[PDB]
Amino acid sequence: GSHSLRYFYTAVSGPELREPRFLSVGYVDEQQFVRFDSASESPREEPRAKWIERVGEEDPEYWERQTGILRRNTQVFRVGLETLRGYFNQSAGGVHTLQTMYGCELTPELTFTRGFDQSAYDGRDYISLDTDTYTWTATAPQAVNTKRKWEADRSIAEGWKAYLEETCVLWLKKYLEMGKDTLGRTDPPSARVTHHTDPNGDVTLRCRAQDFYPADISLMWLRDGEEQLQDTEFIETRPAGDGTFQKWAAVQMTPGQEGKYTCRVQHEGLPEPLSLKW
């Protein structure tokens, strides 16, 4: 479906920590491919997908470059944790969190649709970039002083536009080719219905899907044609730990009524949805 390249930066201050700690992950589509932790012995950006170890043989300074960027981003966020503390007039010594995600998205046909750059202080939206205007939306009211900082320097919006709509786009295309075998695969789900009798005596049917990629899936329990928003419990989609995802949808009924119900399972990987009865 869509494609994307996203980075997730998290910095936390603490009484436990002498300086605040900085962590970073990068994703192509739903697969994680790099990471960085300010608190390692020698903090360095490291591969976490097999296809990115390629990158060095036609870009030798790749890992060095990223590392420098992330060492400097480490100090950018430490400084920022202190600046924002002042904005929110808070005691020193606390536990505080500052986050940023950014990246770009393409169509299935590999054309840019959207870039983003968004930040949060203590789990609350702080500031974000409006991609169509390249101005700064101050969501937190005391983010307006950050907003005036960054708008007073056109090279900030200009550098995001160049990065979001060209640099990010070109690196994502390259990663996609580099990761052809894994990032191009679309994996249909296997699916199965299980039967469970509850201590009171009623019957739970559970429609289970696993081994699918991407993670978007529709699980529907039809009682003789009709959705059952009634007694239908879902679990949140979860990672198997090998690239794929699992989700199940349950439903409750009186013993004898099983044959009415059906589970429809649709997903990008299946020609036709799956119909499953108990």
């Binding site: 990068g26 981003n73 966020f77 400084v79 930040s119 702080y126 983010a143 900082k149």
Partner: peptide
């Protein structure tokens, strides 16, 4: 590709 961010 990682990006160098700005002081808030």
């Amino acid at each position: 590709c990682n990006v160098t961010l700005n002081y808030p």
